[model samples]
Target: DSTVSLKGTDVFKADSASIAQNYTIPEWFKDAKFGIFIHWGVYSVPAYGSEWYSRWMYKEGHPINKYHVQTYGPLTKFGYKDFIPMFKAENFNADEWLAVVKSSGAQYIVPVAEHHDGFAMYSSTFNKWNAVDMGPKRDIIGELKEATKKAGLRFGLSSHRCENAWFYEYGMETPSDVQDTTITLYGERLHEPEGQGMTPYCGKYEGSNERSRRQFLMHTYELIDKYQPELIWFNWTVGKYPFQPTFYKFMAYYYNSALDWNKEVVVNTKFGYGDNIQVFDIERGKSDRIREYPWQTDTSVGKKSWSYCVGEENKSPDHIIDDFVDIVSKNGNLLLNIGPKADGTITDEQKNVLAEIGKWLKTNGEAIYGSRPWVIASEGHNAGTAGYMTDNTKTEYTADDIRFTTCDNNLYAVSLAWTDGSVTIKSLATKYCRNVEIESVEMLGSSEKIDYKMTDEGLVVNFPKNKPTEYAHVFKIKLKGVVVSKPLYDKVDNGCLITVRVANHNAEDANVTLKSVVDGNEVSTQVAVKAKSEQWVKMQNKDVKSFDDMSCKFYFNDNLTYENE
Candidate 1:
């Protein structure tokens, strides 16, 4: 147990009322919003398939199952225990992996310490089923914590052991199959006496039974006590559903432990417990837009497997970077995954992508890390939708993905992709803006200046002689006055709806939503945003679009939203 010292303190009472203090969004986390997740584990040892080693082995005629058998034999013959010794982690490098992450400008790092396999990467006394006793014989999470802390990054852990109970449900069931839970999984005489009626070494490691549940609570609590992690992420809906009693107990335990330190905390909800769940982190999915709360999408580089397989065709670095840009503009964070190899080494392929992203972030970190969403997310570029997994590599993004963001009184018009020539923004071409003084016009990735001139039509910019970086670009345009009360947008029938944008001009990562009320009812939906870099959609017919007490809402993802009713 870690030490806690204070001049005065009271023992936390069970079910007692504790002041619900608000959590502060750390500047580091908010600024460096994009991070990479590493989910590699013993499953990587095989390196031939997905992470579901125990379950897929039972699914007859499945591709991974066949591969599992061919590579490591059946569970009955070899079992998951056999692979424990094979995990040598021969190529693991703490400094090198962290270097890539730091270069990518990731403010935080989450590594799977204990996955569904029930294998603890750290040394655990609660169970012999741990990495130290059987697997690579090293404290994996320990090394990671050391490296990440040394490099000044937030460290987090992923606990997917909740699936350990359900994992037994899918193993081999036939008598000859030997993968049945009935027999001892370790060896003939390996079953513990306490586990005789408990389906050998497989079922109910920590729930249902009081002793087992306490065991589960112990290891988990130990991890929290030892690590004091900034984020403790759980898979499979926070905790097992039917075990709500235990779930609450665990949450309370974690909260109390963390409250003492005053350290910021975060936990992921896998399809459960989202009510008042302040900072939510989504996984492999996306949401439209919400208010006053930040959200994140945790996705992997590989398409089929969490770990690197021989031929896994993951998205390219440019595609991944584009997705990051889109999510940032929409007031969301993108937590990307990098699958390491069986030897605990990052593949060259993953490294190459990391370099590409690192290069981009190094050049444009200022615009990305500290900026807030603008009035418009899609205004000037031909970009894709805003959300997790909303981008596709095959799809080409034009100039329509321009978003806006702000810092104090400064406004930024972020281009989704690099521009070849010049473009004009009708929105910025306002009478008020023209008469107002112009401060400067600078692009994001490069120091090149764009030739700008204000006209009765709009603000027009001429491109530089040399092309800058090609991914996404930003134009920091400082103008007179705060520009908060500027004519945002006026609703039009079959035309642009009410205008809502970032205060100081950050629109590159903004997500704009609209709502209409009819008969005392409200209809809210996501509206598509275009970029000024792309061709603008002109008004076909200027007719009054009417609704009783209508409002257009703009969301800056968890920071703030405006309702112009």
Candidate 2:
């Protein structure tokens, strides 16, 4: 019955069809809504450009290429491999790292097992160029898994190796070490233009052989059989047509192996396979609506770079927390990323952001964890913008803005910002909760009960004389099964009609009002729609030419008001 805790042990057999038919998202993943994604590797040693430094630094006239030439000589003299010795992660402490993540209130940790640089962060039997043999000389994944288990957290790994087929394709044009066939680790392949980032995935191979694809599959399966990651996250290239067969093979093998291990497993992919079979991951973006199935958004803490780089601009904890709360309300998880220095230590700024978020969760986690989207995800002035990319502009949230999450018989009304004195939730107007009686209303982190009244307009709650927290404030509302009134509207060709039904359990007749705004003019009408009744209203062509351009307001019993935009 506990929603906050994990559902414990589970399993499913192999066979793509069978596994796909029986697979259900583990309760643990749903409850563990926030996770930490680490993007650290040899790229950090350069610390100049972004994680794509390996690809872009070889291109002439590029800033990273210029910087490399000025500082470390030419790409041929001081290539990516020359920096491996500098990446000695001498101060690497797995426990210390996990401790920092746990302090951030994150439930799971996913580190880059392999990045696009063709360098493996883990000890791989299929490749000699790995952490265990070079650079760190430590099994990074093994150490991280141990620390994660000891701290009672789930362990996962991310692989960006598929993109390596063309990641260093430009290096062949120059005399850089990346063109050296003797150094197989440097990705010696014939040139293919590194088109715009990771898009328009070209399956074209100039120097790639069948062994390369085989090795990729072998390395991935080794990760599953060796590390047994609960979650295996892949980058964008998995969706390409070239890797489809091998990708499916890995999925089938991972699922089948989970059956043998008697453990629940998950595969997080960027663009391959539908959400029905696996979790769909949106890179640096989020869905605007509540998806029917579970999904995730993997975004980095650093605004400019996914890996450690000089002069990296990181987002504030306030911005991150607001985004996290908003994502939870929309029935999605936030996989926030962090990039550590090659020395194996997190930046103080990054740690500070995580600490601040952890402190906020310490008090307001009751409203976050184990909660699902309410009837309406959010109700407020801003209402959030609709887009795949995140907006970094400073958003000024007022008391008029709020978001909702529901758990069991409790509804959490989260004020995006501090409500100086009182707050109102328009969705929970007295007319909506006819069957349910409000048993209690209180702030999440405080024992002081709130003074609340259910009116036709909404649930207006008066706060105490002082503010409780500096961040978002939450109101815990307990009730029986709430009968939420719904407004149904449909625009047929050239006509618009709105139908609203009163709650069946409504105690008394509710007076509902309908108002419309069209062509810069406002028109309004009121109706005494009784309890347990339905009211149908239609607007003329002059009043509402199109539903998309019309804005309506429904006032229930003169107190509850709904803004239909």
Candidate 3:
């Protein structure tokens, strides 16, 4: 029944609407399009399987279950609890970790505070099985927080503590050390939901049945009070039906505390309620369309597991960069993850990938950080594919795959891969550009003068001989005129289909037309754009490619004339 002492107005309450209406997305988070997520715990000791090694090792017929018995005697003699002693983390230097992650162009860092294994990575007042009490004998989260601030990066924490409620139930059903009365590391009691994997909760933790509710609340408060992280990521269970009540309370607590600290904070959840209250997070996935509100995609560098595993192969830097560009173009941020070995060292495979991404960011970071989505998210190829929980795979975006971002009143077109000779962005075609005029175009990294043109097909730019970055190349398109947006284009078999939202921002009605500039031939399509209102106009060309050779377009009406728009 304890809550933090507030120093300001209670603008936010333990309710959805209040939090949604009053909450605002932090500007810093919006500017920081990239961050790092760290997954490290006692499970790193085994290093042979997934981070759920503790739970799986006790279950029968699982791969890690057999491996555990063969490798480390038996579950009765040496259980998951025994791994705490082996998690020495002798070489765990926070500065060293920060240096490598920071080199990846990460503006923020989130370390797992308490994983489902019921082990706290920080010194905790509630949990005895913590980093300072047992395994490393040092507060891992504390070290990272200090190093993160010293390195001038924002900090956050992820808590999977609620999942601990049923994490060890598989062990209790079998003949294992989990039955030992002395072992309280497994949680107070079983609160397993009804189903195979993660399923919906049917009022399980309601009323007085919540045996472990107080601890969860207290632990969360401790993290918020102690670290005061700029962001806090809760696991998937928080949005479940049984957990919504406490979740609301936690949100109220965190937002009020932020008022006390006078800091901009963020809350990310996998199963969040309102779009405004919490930033919806995708696990190893992204939205196919540009989201109006900010969102995030979290995926690990490793393909096999979230924790350090034997013979782990990491994703290439090119793949990560391509996905990152796509995420940014869709009004979302990417929280790249990395797992450290039990010896407190990162492998060469992982380090090299981070270094390459850092190199790319250094060359074209202006297109990423602080950039917002453009009229369209992407073009050129299957840009609408939903990459949900597909981190195990790679997205090989070719030169044809282009994503757009806007920053500092400039449009940036980033080709996911290097071009063979030249690249054309059809979305920027003369007819599709609406009321804007392109002033100049320049490559973000290369100093060579840019050569380009605006044809009926698209904005074509020739590649520079000197390649600046190895991954993605950015072309900064600076505009000089017009107060407007552009029409969205879909390449039809006949030619291109343009959906134009024409606004007559005038006191009187006006007529509009999509005319071809090559011969000044009209498309014979005109509509009365209502005054002080807008209308959806569609225009199409049957032979756009053929017209590309000697064509550009102009739009006009009785009240306004758009020349070389």
Candidate 4:
């Protein structure tokens, strides 16, 4: 009965199929290959352990707990709650922060609206423990959103507030300040007899307290109304919550609100990709191969913590750049993170890392932004591994490690490392690239003439006398055009599903024909793909045929530019 009132047109129903049918990844999101993530909060006050300091400080025999006693007093005297007043954010400057974010070469920014600490970084109506009411006495998210939009970057916010249920459960184990059930800031689950320990999601509809769940809904709804963020990212704890039905309704509300505002919006999560109503976000991890759907990798510049802390170990620009290149080539976007200090100052080490990345992007952004993954994601020794998100060690990339992305009839071949001599891209061998002819070859930021040749092995490009940048080098190969196909046999229809992906960049829709040879006989297939969009034409082969019966030689605009493989 206490459900939050949703305010928008009912363009979507609270169901997976309905949501997925009406959903499409926004064009801006696809074109924007990189964004910035801010992880600032009350946790910055302690500035010793990571962002989990509150949870750790209450656990018995935990290092943070032990340190808390020695550093301040007992939890009974000075618990996590006492740190609120310490978070003055005295030096916080929204314009300054946005300026730095804008200079990072990121096209979008997402700040944490409410982290797992149950502390709202924005002006929250449902929660009193917010930046506006307490810590910063300012609407952190509102300021960031206004500044971000003014800076001409898309803005989004993260909601990790649901995890507040058990975030301070450890405090209940002993006579801690969280033992006071009157303190609502600690959350409803704080004083429960037993904590939701390592909560397991059985994929069954479980019941959650309706009134308590409303608080979460209200906070999220308020964020949408106040900021109108293009995206709202959620933590993995979303699926594990008992508000399974409520969660679906929330997405519907968000999508509906986007419709009212006449804008494209998205929800990012690790929860089954929200069945296409949302974008998938990988936390500090990498995808091993190319995925059909768009996804994002969120990792911090500092490996130690998502929030600033003493002696935080930040990554070098080269490591982030190499990883960023690999991710973009595999149909993924990178949401690089930086944790500002408690006083609202971003660390110099982190600043330099971003500056270096911006410098490289300024020269080689054509290879990244507004590009799509080619038929091959990577070539040679470094096939992507099943990534452990937390591990941030840099792989010693060699000259053989190459990544590929296609944009407007041009192919970008980027080497993860600086090559001492000429680099050979094995994927572009004569056997693989038929009908596709290379028209010109040049480095991204070099005036030196590119000397290259194509042999049986691959496309060989001689390295210039000097490299373009310090990190990954890009070699742009202008091609006539490109064709990506997914050919498979379908037993249900007794045919082959040859789905051809053709990217159209014109203002008006265009019709393209697909012609091929079958048993030395020429045949044709016709379809009109959309304009200024990426479409996959899923077609079935001739009835009563095997998969190998036909060879597709793509005919674009009624002309056969693609040759048989």
Taking the candidates one at a time, how many backbone clashes does each contain?
Answer: 37, 4, 0, 0
Error of 3 at 111 (Å): 0.7
Compared with the true structure, all predictions reach lDDT values of 0.59, 0.74, 0.78, 0.77
lDDT measured at residue 190 in model 3 versus the true structure, 0 to 100? 69
Query: Tens digit of lDDT per residue, candidate 1, span 1-565?
Result: 1122211353332221321333334455556677878977777877676787655665556686677678767656866667778888888878777887887778888888777666778877765777777667877888888999999888988777655544544453432243453543311111112233212223333333443445456767878877788777776423334444455556556656667887767656544354244346655654443224456777888777777777888778767776676667656777888899888888777778877887888877766787666544445435454443343333476664566655555666666666667667555544223124577888765666679997655567665666456576767777752122222444456434333332323233223333433223343444343322111111121233554444344333221233555
Ranking by lDDT: 3, 4, 2, 1
- The sequence of per-residue lDDT tens digits that candidate 4 reaches over residues 1-565 is 1133543446677777778888787878878989999899888998887999978888889999999899989989998889999999999998888888888799899899988788889887778888998978999998998898789989988998776776887888888988898887777554222224323353433323555567777777888898899989887666654665667777888888888899998788775435356778788887876767888888999988999999888999988998998889878899999999998998889888888988999999999999998766787786644363643868778878999888875779998887768888876654444344667898899999989988766788888888889889999987643333333223434444444556543445666666544334455667675644556555544543555544555444455434546
lDDT (Cα) of model 4: 0.77
**TM-score: model 3 vs. ground truth:** 0.84
Q: Please write out the lDDT profile of model 3 over residues 435-510, one tens digit for every residue.
A: 4456789998899998998776778888888889888899998763222234344566646655554544344566
Better model by lDDT: candidate 1 vs candidate 2? 2
Candidate 2 global TM-score: 0.83
The true-versus-predicted C-alpha distance at residue 374 of model 4, in Å, is 0.9
| Residue pairs in collision within model 3 | none
**Cα-based lDDT at residue 527, candidate 1:** 34
* Tens digit per residue, CA lDDT, model 2, 253-364: 6776677788877789876476777887877777666665778878888988889989988988877877788788877888999999879889999999899888889988
